[PDB]
């Protein structure tokens, strides 16, 4: 039984960040990883998605070439070219992460970890036992797929994981889901030339975002050539002579349901949710609490119900983002190894960017949320909608929408929501201001930068 | 003698902003404009420059097309196409501004204003007299050109004004100056295909910016194909059989001077400075103080030395930016018409973006300036340099450099300097944070947005 100061199960965003900071603080740490280091973000998430987004962005920009004075660009996108380069880049990152661990003196234990029946919390990997007074579970999640029992032929569809394995651009693609992953995948497939449909259960995507954003985003998708199938769900999938045939039920409220077949589908992509990866951990041998989806339950300090067992990141089911896993893992290392007892992540005011076309940035409360926290009488919003100057000379157009949610007489800025060209890079510093408690006077008293889209946020009236 | 509550001389950025706010406050105002409304920014500045930058940006992006999986884009940029569209857009703005004035009930007096010999400050426009207890001079500036006496044939060169009149892309262009305007013009001409040289008196451009930026910017220019002629100045210009011939002196320190002729020059562009437009105002009839360049001198509240005469914007010679003229004109209207005596613009922490390739964003003190304000022992900087993920798959590369200047033990953020893709839209919100007095802990405690360039600023170590 090898003993360490800190054992980290999972070498993804949160596990690596926590292990590294712990080691800086003098901990003797080991990371257990059964697949590739870098976890979901590097291998099948953030990174490869962003490369594909940059690619889709080129496709759009190329539509405006002629408007800008240049000769019309003619063609066909070659999927394999970028796929090969994308894979190589991921390989480069994997090697870097590994080196980061080695330079820090963190041991990498390769294999699948499971808790043992032993009294003091102990794990087993490949027959060998390992123990530590502090064990972090950061095993992340996985894409959720429907059961063949509820949707027959569901297994003919792929998930976001399968998207990263594709080697050719699918001719006809149907994406099921209305969350950010669904939205991003649809936007990439469509821009690159797949005839794409997005199938949602209601009438708008991103229903948990501020309603200005969910409305605007749904419109932008339509405008970009994505067919949004509203109030629709899949009833069955079947393998035909030439691709797939999707049976769907459309049930507009106030109307009779109608069943439609979607033929000649090359790619059916389930983007319906994520499930936590806890199933094969033997949690129950320690009685560690989970919810009914399998999420590990923790307190504000990332503690599980068992002393010396912590959990961070996706496996916890809250705020499923790489930077949150990182920040939570770092704060936890400071608490454990630097004895900063008050060290923990504040889950409010976490900023998010959705890589749609144009991209979306949001931080803080939606208008409704502020309304429920402070009362209608105490909430005031400011918004603007305009066509960015980029489009002044183009036939193709996109819009930029921005909304600021203020509370109390002081007009404290409690939410910023926007969609538009440049919004992916614009959000970070306003997130800093929001975190600091800025009021609207603070924004207004900041001299604008002209001509930019960002200046609109400091000139709202 | 027609009397108003407020007379504004000049209908550009600051004059229009001030007149509009005054009118909201109940003032009966009139704007005197001898040319086009919108002034320098709209007609020959910010706006047309940005359109040309977006055009240059397309040119670059088109170099990466093939790397991204698409077929090589082949050609020749057509200057007149975009020129025509750019001019139309400016025409659209002129009409909008005019309408803005009318909707506000502001009178537009068309013509050139000059002060009169009259005791109570009075102006004359086209034979008629106008007076007000509050008169704002916001006449802006103009490009500076050398005297034929010092540089013979200087008048064969054009200025940034002339740049906006060009109808064809010059084959060979030489730009003289090392300030932002010079840098921007060179970057646009070069990206669009002119064989471009930038002639600077020292070894770096943007010498008043943080030295990380002046170094990086000079390198990026070289890397983008701009020939930077260091320690060089023009000695004479002459009209040859086929364009211009520029005689220059290069005087590297530690070396002997060497004279070179530059032949076959299509376009010689002077970007050496701006001069205030005060010369034809008859200021001296009121004894209004100017400095030796012709700038009107004002106090912190924009007052001139004469009661009821104010000046804002470029004519004052400080912080030559549209948003500063706007903010100063607005604060002044609140002071005059809302009786807010403490109403004035804080000239610290004004953010700037330079539309180079990649763009530059800066706010606050350079490292040297912090060093002189606080002492070397009290200044600590943080910086990073990296290749944006956009280039992971391209043969062409650009870099991103960021620097944070902190002061005192608390590490108050007193300066942010950066250059890189996306930096034009990234700056605004950090400018808000800087204005509010953020410290480095405030940045560090803000959860990152991944994957973006902006996240680097909140993860500096
Ligand atoms: C398509 C997609 C796009 C995304 N885009 C973004 C984005 O742009 N920005 C963003 O912020 N977030 C994005 N996310 C979310 C981000 O990827 C996750 O929030 C993040 O990866 C969660 O980190 P984690 O540390 O919890 O887990 P993970 O990164 O998943 O890592 C868990 C690791 O544990 C390993 N493991 C699991 N069980 C065991 C075991 N028993 N023994 C040993 N090893 C084990 C796994 O192999 C894995 O490497 C995206 C996600 C997806 C799916
Ligand atoms: C090439 C270039 C690019 C620039 N790019 C940017 C940029 O991207 N961002 C930025 O913030 N700033 C930029 N600037 C600077 C910005 O244009 C100026 O700071 C801004 O225009 C100054 O406003 P102003 O109100 O002082 O004067 P102006 O806008 O110049 O207006 C002065 C007005 O007064 C009129 N006038 C003058 N004298 C009289 C008289 N006697 N009677 C009647 N009317 C009169 C003039 O015709 C004019 O319309 C740029 C400038 C240039 C030259």
mmCIF file of N, CA, C and O in Angstrom, chain A residues 235-298:
data_model
loop_
_atom_site.group_PDB
_atom_site.id
_atom_site.type_symbol
_atom_site.label_atom_id
_atom_site.label_comp_id
_atom_site.label_asym_id
_atom_site.label_seq_id
_atom_site.Cartn_x
_atom_site.Cartn_y
_atom_site.Cartn_z
ATOM 1 N N UNK A 235 -38.800 9.738 -32.133
ATOM 2 C CA UNK A 235 -39.566 8.640 -31.715
ATOM 3 C C UNK A 235 -38.885 7.360 -32.072
ATOM 4 O O UNK A 235 -38.942 6.381 -31.326
ATOM 5 N N UNK A 236 -38.190 7.361 -33.182
ATOM 6 C CA UNK A 236 -37.488 6.160 -33.556
ATOM 7 C C UNK A 236 -36.472 6.449 -34.612
ATOM 8 O O UNK A 236 -36.603 7.394 -35.355
ATOM 9 N N UNK A 237 -35.440 5.632 -34.632
ATOM 10 C CA UNK A 237 -34.398 5.784 -35.636
ATOM 11 C C UNK A 237 -34.182 4.484 -36.342
ATOM 12 O O UNK A 237 -34.072 3.464 -35.693
ATOM 13 N N UNK A 238 -34.024 4.539 -37.646
ATOM 14 C CA UNK A 238 -33.738 3.319 -38.345
ATOM 15 C C UNK A 238 -32.765 3.500 -39.534
ATOM 16 O O UNK A 238 -32.664 4.565 -40.183
ATOM 17 N N UNK A 239 -31.979 2.446 -39.767
ATOM 18 C CA UNK A 239 -30.915 2.386 -40.757
ATOM 19 C C UNK A 239 -31.527 1.993 -42.076
ATOM 20 O O UNK A 239 -32.008 0.934 -42.184
ATOM 21 N N UNK A 240 -31.580 2.888 -43.033
ATOM 22 C CA UNK A 240 -32.165 2.613 -44.308
ATOM 23 C C UNK A 240 -31.071 2.272 -45.225
ATOM 24 O O UNK A 240 -29.938 2.182 -44.819
ATOM 25 N N UNK A 241 -31.434 2.175 -46.488
ATOM 26 C CA UNK A 241 -30.534 1.793 -47.579
ATOM 27 C C UNK A 241 -29.396 2.802 -47.759
ATOM 28 O O UNK A 241 -28.266 2.463 -48.218
ATOM 29 N N UNK A 242 -29.745 4.046 -47.453
ATOM 30 C CA UNK A 242 -28.820 5.113 -47.611
ATOM 31 C C UNK A 242 -28.940 6.159 -46.495
ATOM 32 O O UNK A 242 -29.530 7.280 -46.623
ATOM 33 N N UNK A 243 -28.403 5.697 -45.366
ATOM 34 C CA UNK A 243 -28.309 6.488 -44.169
ATOM 35 C C UNK A 243 -29.391 6.170 -43.162
ATOM 36 O O UNK A 243 -29.851 5.051 -43.012
ATOM 37 N N UNK A 244 -29.782 7.181 -42.442
ATOM 38 C CA UNK A 244 -30.724 6.959 -41.403
ATOM 39 C C UNK A 244 -32.045 7.629 -41.749
ATOM 40 O O UNK A 244 -32.099 8.582 -42.544
ATOM 41 N N UNK A 245 -33.103 7.105 -41.086
ATOM 42 C CA UNK A 245 -34.453 7.679 -41.191
ATOM 43 C C UNK A 245 -34.945 7.971 -39.804
ATOM 44 O O UNK A 245 -35.087 7.050 -38.995
ATOM 45 N N UNK A 246 -35.225 9.253 -39.557
ATOM 46 C CA UNK A 246 -35.609 9.686 -38.222
ATOM 47 C C UNK A 246 -37.097 9.949 -38.183
ATOM 48 O O UNK A 246 -37.595 10.757 -38.932
ATOM 49 N N UNK A 247 -37.735 9.278 -37.250
ATOM 50 C CA UNK A 247 -39.149 9.455 -37.066
ATOM 51 C C UNK A 247 -39.339 10.447 -35.999
ATOM 52 O O UNK A 247 -38.858 10.245 -34.911
ATOM 53 N N UNK A 248 -40.054 11.492 -36.286
ATOM 54 C CA UNK A 248 -40.231 12.406 -35.204
ATOM 55 C C UNK A 248 -41.692 12.809 -34.998
ATOM 56 O O UNK A 248 -42.505 12.772 -35.933
ATOM 57 N N UNK A 249 -41.977 13.221 -33.732
ATOM 58 C CA UNK A 249 -43.279 13.737 -33.343
ATOM 59 C C UNK A 249 -43.147 15.239 -33.069
ATOM 60 O O UNK A 249 -42.233 15.652 -32.330
ATOM 61 N N UNK A 250 -43.977 16.091 -33.742
ATOM 62 C CA UNK A 250 -43.999 17.518 -33.532
ATOM 63 C C UNK A 250 -45.316 17.815 -32.814
ATOM 64 O O UNK A 250 -46.364 17.380 -33.274
ATOM 65 N N UNK A 251 -45.267 18.472 -31.656
ATOM 66 C CA UNK A 251 -46.469 18.713 -30.887
ATOM 67 C C UNK A 251 -46.521 20.143 -30.456
ATOM 68 O O UNK A 251 -46.190 20.416 -29.316
ATOM 69 N N UNK A 252 -46.894 21.043 -31.401
ATOM 70 C CA UNK A 252 -47.089 22.455 -31.135
ATOM 71 C C UNK A 252 -48.277 22.585 -30.209
ATOM 72 O O UNK A 252 -49.260 21.859 -30.346
ATOM 73 N N UNK A 253 -48.177 23.421 -29.201
ATOM 74 C CA UNK A 253 -49.297 23.506 -28.319
ATOM 75 C C UNK A 253 -50.383 24.285 -29.051
ATOM 76 O O UNK A 253 -50.134 25.282 -29.802
ATOM 77 N N UNK A 254 -51.597 23.697 -28.947
ATOM 78 C CA UNK A 254 -52.784 24.226 -29.633
ATOM 79 C C UNK A 254 -52.940 23.539 -30.985
ATOM 80 O O UNK A 254 -53.577 24.014 -31.915
ATOM 81 N N UNK A 255 -52.365 22.398 -31.085
ATOM 82 C CA UNK A 255 -52.409 21.803 -32.355
ATOM 83 C C UNK A 255 -52.396 20.379 -32.202
ATOM 84 O O UNK A 255 -52.033 19.901 -31.158
ATOM 85 N N UNK A 256 -52.738 19.661 -33.264
ATOM 86 C CA UNK A 256 -52.624 18.213 -33.127
ATOM 87 C C UNK A 256 -51.166 17.759 -33.415
ATOM 88 O O UNK A 256 -50.475 18.321 -34.295
ATOM 89 N N UNK A 257 -50.732 16.699 -32.727
ATOM 90 C CA UNK A 257 -49.415 16.143 -32.984
ATOM 91 C C UNK A 257 -49.324 15.620 -34.419
ATOM 92 O O UNK A 257 -50.285 15.085 -34.984
ATOM 93 N N UNK A 258 -48.132 15.683 -34.974
ATOM 94 C CA UNK A 258 -47.958 15.228 -36.285
ATOM 95 C C UNK A 258 -46.638 14.476 -36.346
ATOM 96 O O UNK A 258 -45.670 14.899 -35.751
ATOM 97 N N UNK A 259 -46.631 13.320 -36.957
ATOM 98 C CA UNK A 259 -45.455 12.483 -37.060
ATOM 99 C C UNK A 259 -44.870 12.702 -38.436
ATOM 100 O O UNK A 259 -45.612 12.813 -39.364
ATOM 101 N N UNK A 260 -43.529 12.862 -38.533
ATOM 102 C CA UNK A 260 -42.772 13.144 -39.790
ATOM 103 C C UNK A 260 -41.584 12.215 -39.846
ATOM 104 O O UNK A 260 -40.985 11.939 -38.826
ATOM 105 N N UNK A 261 -41.213 11.801 -41.037
ATOM 106 C CA UNK A 261 -40.044 10.969 -41.169
ATOM 107 C C UNK A 261 -39.014 11.859 -41.723
ATOM 108 O O UNK A 261 -39.374 12.646 -42.598
ATOM 109 N N UNK A 262 -37.747 11.764 -41.220
ATOM 110 C CA UNK A 262 -36.629 12.526 -41.820
ATOM 111 C C UNK A 262 -35.701 11.477 -42.402
ATOM 112 O O UNK A 262 -35.163 10.637 -41.700
ATOM 113 N N UNK A 263 -35.581 11.534 -43.737
ATOM 114 C CA UNK A 263 -34.855 10.552 -44.538
ATOM 115 C C UNK A 263 -33.483 11.009 -44.922
ATOM 116 O O UNK A 263 -33.204 12.229 -44.962
ATOM 117 N N UNK A 264 -32.667 10.007 -45.288
ATOM 118 C CA UNK A 264 -31.352 10.261 -45.841
ATOM 119 C C UNK A 264 -30.467 11.040 -44.885
ATOM 120 O O UNK A 264 -29.708 11.933 -45.325
ATOM 121 N N UNK A 265 -30.570 10.699 -43.611
ATOM 122 C CA UNK A 265 -29.751 11.373 -42.609
ATOM 123 C C UNK A 265 -28.368 10.668 -42.467
ATOM 124 O O UNK A 265 -28.256 9.466 -42.295
ATOM 125 N N UNK A 266 -27.293 11.449 -42.584
ATOM 126 C CA UNK A 266 -25.962 10.917 -42.490
ATOM 127 C C UNK A 266 -25.496 10.854 -41.041
ATOM 128 O O UNK A 266 -24.865 9.915 -40.587
ATOM 129 N N UNK A 267 -25.815 11.891 -40.332
ATOM 130 C CA UNK A 267 -25.354 12.016 -38.992
ATOM 131 C C UNK A 267 -26.505 12.410 -38.011
ATOM 132 O O UNK A 267 -27.081 13.506 -38.143
ATOM 133 N N UNK A 268 -26.779 11.578 -37.012
ATOM 134 C CA UNK A 268 -27.743 11.917 -35.980
ATOM 135 C C UNK A 268 -26.908 12.116 -34.726
ATOM 136 O O UNK A 268 -26.226 11.209 -34.312
ATOM 137 N N UNK A 269 -26.939 13.319 -34.183
ATOM 138 C CA UNK A 269 -26.089 13.677 -33.064
ATOM 139 C C UNK A 269 -26.925 14.001 -31.848
ATOM 140 O O UNK A 269 -27.657 14.996 -31.847
ATOM 141 N N UNK A 270 -26.802 13.182 -30.812
ATOM 142 C CA UNK A 270 -27.516 13.373 -29.538
ATOM 143 C C UNK A 270 -26.728 14.389 -28.707
ATOM 144 O O UNK A 270 -25.558 14.119 -28.359
ATOM 145 N N UNK A 271 -27.337 15.530 -28.353
ATOM 146 C CA UNK A 271 -26.692 16.534 -27.510
ATOM 147 C C UNK A 271 -27.713 16.912 -26.442
ATOM 148 O O UNK A 271 -28.093 18.095 -26.281
ATOM 149 N N UNK A 272 -28.114 15.857 -25.762
ATOM 150 C CA UNK A 272 -29.171 15.941 -24.795
ATOM 151 C C UNK A 272 -28.741 16.114 -23.370
ATOM 152 O O UNK A 272 -29.584 16.474 -22.579
ATOM 153 N N UNK A 273 -27.481 15.852 -23.028
ATOM 154 C CA UNK A 273 -27.037 16.062 -21.644
ATOM 155 C C UNK A 273 -25.749 15.324 -21.400
ATOM 156 O O UNK A 273 -25.188 14.695 -22.309
ATOM 157 N N UNK A 274 -25.297 15.398 -20.132
ATOM 158 C CA UNK A 274 -24.081 14.693 -19.713
ATOM 159 C C UNK A 274 -24.374 13.953 -18.446
ATOM 160 O O UNK A 274 -25.085 14.433 -17.590
ATOM 161 N N UNK A 275 -23.753 12.831 -18.306
ATOM 162 C CA UNK A 275 -23.962 12.042 -17.139
ATOM 163 C C UNK A 275 -22.609 11.965 -16.370
ATOM 164 O O UNK A 275 -21.570 11.982 -17.012
ATOM 165 N N UNK A 276 -22.613 11.882 -15.021
ATOM 166 C CA UNK A 276 -21.324 11.863 -14.276
ATOM 167 C C UNK A 276 -20.692 10.515 -14.376
ATOM 168 O O UNK A 276 -21.337 9.512 -14.463
ATOM 169 N N UNK A 277 -19.379 10.504 -14.343
ATOM 170 C CA UNK A 277 -18.646 9.257 -14.468
ATOM 171 C C UNK A 277 -18.348 8.726 -13.028
ATOM 172 O O UNK A 277 -17.289 9.026 -12.427
ATOM 173 N N UNK A 278 -19.295 8.012 -12.397
ATOM 174 C CA UNK A 278 -19.132 7.555 -11.005
ATOM 175 C C UNK A 278 -19.520 6.098 -10.811
ATOM 176 O O UNK A 278 -19.303 5.457 -9.794
ATOM 177 N N UNK A 279 -20.154 5.639 -11.802
ATOM 178 C CA UNK A 279 -20.694 4.338 -11.876
ATOM 179 C C UNK A 279 -19.665 3.241 -11.559
ATOM 180 O O UNK A 279 -19.995 2.239 -10.882
ATOM 181 N N UNK A 280 -18.424 3.365 -12.063
ATOM 182 C CA UNK A 280 -17.481 2.268 -11.825
ATOM 183 C C UNK A 280 -16.446 2.526 -10.718
ATOM 184 O O UNK A 280 -15.440 1.854 -10.634
ATOM 185 N N UNK A 281 -16.719 3.473 -9.861
ATOM 186 C CA UNK A 281 -15.811 3.899 -8.799
ATOM 187 C C UNK A 281 -15.946 3.088 -7.470
ATOM 188 O O UNK A 281 -15.121 3.197 -6.535
ATOM 189 N N UNK A 282 -17.012 2.321 -7.341
ATOM 190 C CA UNK A 282 -17.293 1.614 -6.078
ATOM 191 C C UNK A 282 -17.498 2.523 -4.923
ATOM 192 O O UNK A 282 -17.153 2.231 -3.782
ATOM 193 N N UNK A 283 -18.157 3.624 -5.197
ATOM 194 C CA UNK A 283 -18.422 4.634 -4.159
ATOM 195 C C UNK A 283 -19.145 4.073 -2.965
ATOM 196 O O UNK A 283 -18.984 4.521 -1.841
ATOM 197 N N UNK A 284 -20.012 3.170 -3.270
ATOM 198 C CA UNK A 284 -20.859 2.628 -2.265
ATOM 199 C C UNK A 284 -20.072 1.843 -1.247
ATOM 200 O O UNK A 284 -20.619 1.555 -0.205
ATOM 201 N N UNK A 285 -18.803 1.465 -1.533
ATOM 202 C CA UNK A 285 -17.987 0.732 -0.528
ATOM 203 C C UNK A 285 -17.574 1.669 0.583
ATOM 204 O O UNK A 285 -17.168 1.229 1.654
ATOM 205 N N UNK A 286 -17.667 2.978 0.329
ATOM 206 C CA UNK A 286 -17.332 3.989 1.347
ATOM 207 C C UNK A 286 -18.613 4.753 1.786
ATOM 208 O O UNK A 286 -18.617 5.553 2.731
ATOM 209 N N UNK A 287 -19.717 4.460 1.095
ATOM 210 C CA UNK A 287 -20.964 5.123 1.383
ATOM 211 C C UNK A 287 -20.906 6.581 1.001
ATOM 212 O O UNK A 287 -21.477 7.424 1.649
ATOM 213 N N UNK A 288 -20.173 6.917 -0.022
ATOM 214 C CA UNK A 288 -20.094 8.324 -0.449
ATOM 215 C C UNK A 288 -21.453 8.696 -1.100
ATOM 216 O O UNK A 288 -21.932 7.959 -1.947
ATOM 217 N N UNK A 289 -22.049 9.810 -0.724
ATOM 218 C CA UNK A 289 -23.381 10.206 -1.241
ATOM 219 C C UNK A 289 -23.349 10.733 -2.667
ATOM 220 O O UNK A 289 -22.524 11.625 -3.029
ATOM 221 N N UNK A 290 -24.350 10.281 -3.443
ATOM 222 C CA UNK A 290 -24.576 10.770 -4.771
ATOM 223 C C UNK A 290 -26.052 11.152 -4.848
ATOM 224 O O UNK A 290 -26.845 10.821 -3.974
ATOM 225 N N UNK A 291 -26.423 11.859 -5.884
ATOM 226 C CA UNK A 291 -27.830 12.188 -6.101
ATOM 227 C C UNK A 291 -28.356 11.099 -6.997
ATOM 228 O O UNK A 291 -27.666 10.105 -7.303
ATOM 229 N N UNK A 292 -29.570 11.252 -7.475
ATOM 230 C CA UNK A 292 -30.056 10.177 -8.299
ATOM 231 C C UNK A 292 -29.502 10.134 -9.682
ATOM 232 O O UNK A 292 -29.741 9.148 -10.347
ATOM 233 N N UNK A 293 -28.784 11.160 -10.170
ATOM 234 C CA UNK A 293 -28.161 10.986 -11.504
ATOM 235 C C UNK A 293 -26.785 10.390 -11.335
ATOM 236 O O UNK A 293 -26.138 10.169 -12.310
ATOM 237 N N UNK A 294 -26.282 10.227 -10.121
ATOM 238 C CA UNK A 294 -24.937 9.696 -10.019
ATOM 239 C C UNK A 294 -23.969 10.804 -9.674
ATOM 240 O O UNK A 294 -22.764 10.540 -9.578
ATOM 241 N N UNK A 295 -24.436 12.049 -9.468
ATOM 242 C CA UNK A 295 -23.480 13.133 -9.137
ATOM 243 C C UNK A 295 -22.983 12.953 -7.709
ATOM 244 O O UNK A 295 -23.737 12.555 -6.853
ATOM 245 N N UNK A 296 -21.706 13.298 -7.437
ATOM 246 C CA UNK A 296 -21.246 13.249 -6.080
ATOM 247 C C UNK A 296 -21.684 14.529 -5.404
ATOM 248 O O UNK A 296 -21.630 15.640 -5.956
ATOM 249 N N UNK A 297 -22.223 14.404 -4.194
ATOM 250 C CA UNK A 297 -22.704 15.563 -3.487
ATOM 251 C C UNK A 297 -21.530 16.127 -2.659
ATOM 252 O O UNK A 297 -20.802 15.350 -2.034
ATOM 253 N N UNK A 298 -21.372 17.448 -2.644
ATOM 254 C CA UNK A 298 -20.299 18.099 -1.872
ATOM 255 C C UNK A 298 -20.884 19.310 -1.231
ATOM 256 O O UNK A 298 -21.948 19.764 -1.627
#
